[PDB]
């Protein structure tokens, strides 16, 4: 199954995401975090295939998280940014830092699941 981790400081949203993704037969939520530091700690412990990553969060933001994942971890989930902040420089930074996809809030759950499955099933070297 696709193992998903969720990082966002909106607790209600995390619960909705967890409920929906848990209802998909091919997916499982293996961890959630409410800020960037907790997200990094969660990634030390869990090895998701997919990370849903909010940007605006306390302690450490999702772009700092993205940069740390690429530089500091052996195992790397494919990351889907899921944020309200789709500012021109931020989108560009996200792709430079290794994000696999970037979805704006507000979003539809079905579209999100569609992207999860495409990103998991993705590279250029055969
Ligand atoms: Ca936020």
């Amino acid at each position: 199954s696709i193992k998903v981790c969720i990082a966002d400081d909106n607790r209600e949203l995390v619960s909705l995401l967890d409920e929906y993704i848990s209802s998909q037969p091919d997916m499982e939520v293996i961890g959630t975090a409410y800020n960037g530091q907790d997200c990094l700690q969660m990634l030390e412990e869990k090895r998701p295939d997919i990370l849903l990553l909010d940007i605006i969060m306390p302690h450490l933001d999702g772009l700092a998280v993205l940069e740390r994942i690429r530089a500091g971890f052996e195992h790397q989930p494919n990351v889907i940014m899921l944020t309200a902040f789709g500012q021109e420089d931020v989108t560009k930074k996200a792709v430079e830092l290794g994000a696999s996809y970037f979805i704006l809030k507000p979003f539809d759950m079905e579209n999100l699941a569609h992207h999860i499955r495409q990103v998991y099933g993705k590279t250029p070297v055969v």
Side-chain angles (χ1 to χ4, degrees), residues 10-122:
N10 178 332
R11 297 180 125 96
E12 161 81 30
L13 177 59
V14 174
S15 181
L16 292 168
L17 281 168
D18 187 0
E19 164 185 286
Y20 180 86
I21 293 157
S22 300
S23 79
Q24 305 302 295
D26 56 321
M27 297 174 190
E28 175 184 7
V29 178
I30 61 169
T32 56
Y34 301 113
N35 69 60
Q37 279 299 156
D38 289 355
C39 183
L40 293 187
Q41 189 53 229
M42 170 193 64
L43 298 178
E44 288 286 357
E45 300 152 6
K46 273 137 188 191
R47 282 132 172 189
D49 299 303
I50 295 287
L51 171 67
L52 305 179
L53 182 62
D54 180 39
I55 295 171
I56 299 164
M57 296 188 289
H59 296 109
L60 199 56
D61 81 8
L63 295 185
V65 171
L66 206 45
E67 197 154 48
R68 296 260 225 124
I69 288 165
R70 177 175 71 177
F73 285 82
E74 160 162 290
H75 172 70
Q76 272 176 49
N78 277 140
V79 184
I80 294 172
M81 309 308 293
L82 181 55
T83 170
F85 210 82
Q87 194 273 340
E88 287 287 357
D89 306 305
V90 172
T91 55
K92 191 157 58 159
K93 185 62 167 176
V95 71
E96 161 200 324
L97 293 179
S100 298
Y101 201 69
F102 191 117
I103 297 168
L104 279 181
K105 297 172 180 181
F107 63 92
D108 144 44
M109 285 289 177
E110 291 294 333
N111 166 74
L112 171 63
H114 168 74
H115 285 297
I116 293 180
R117 297 179 175 115
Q118 299 244 224
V119 168
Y120 174 81
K122 76 198 173 166

